[PDB]
């Protein structure tokens, strides 16, 4: 928990529909951006803890 990993991801393409169609996730609340309008955007850097 305290030693949380941080993976910097760059130069890739992600569809994010894998996060939708998978029902194993019991917690999925996105805060600053709508996750459905994600594949039509592009961002500088993305970090995955």
């Amino acid at each position: 928990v305290y030693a949380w990993n941080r993976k910097r991801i760059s130069n890739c393409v992600a569809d994010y529909s894998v996060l939708y169609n998978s029902a194993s996730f019991s917690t999925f609340k996105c805060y600053g951006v709508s996750p459905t309008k994600l594949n039509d955007l592009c961002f500088t850097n993305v970090y995955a803890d």
């Binding site: 029902a23 996750p35 459905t36």
Partner: protein, 48 residues
């Protein structure tokens, strides 16, 4: 009236996104009403 999974009770609300909320039952943002739900595992569940 319908019977859904306990994980899908989440989705019956305005502005919600999910499988049931998008493909089975969608509720408008300007909803003027109410929703009531209760567990029925003793009734709608066969032994198999």
């Amino acid at each position: 009236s319908f019977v859904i999974r306990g994980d899908e009770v989440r989705q019956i609300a305005p502005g919600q996104t999910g499988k049931i909320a998008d493909y089975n039952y969608k509720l408008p943002d300007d909803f003027t009403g109410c929703v009531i739900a209760w567990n029925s595992n003793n009734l709608d569940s066969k032994v198999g």
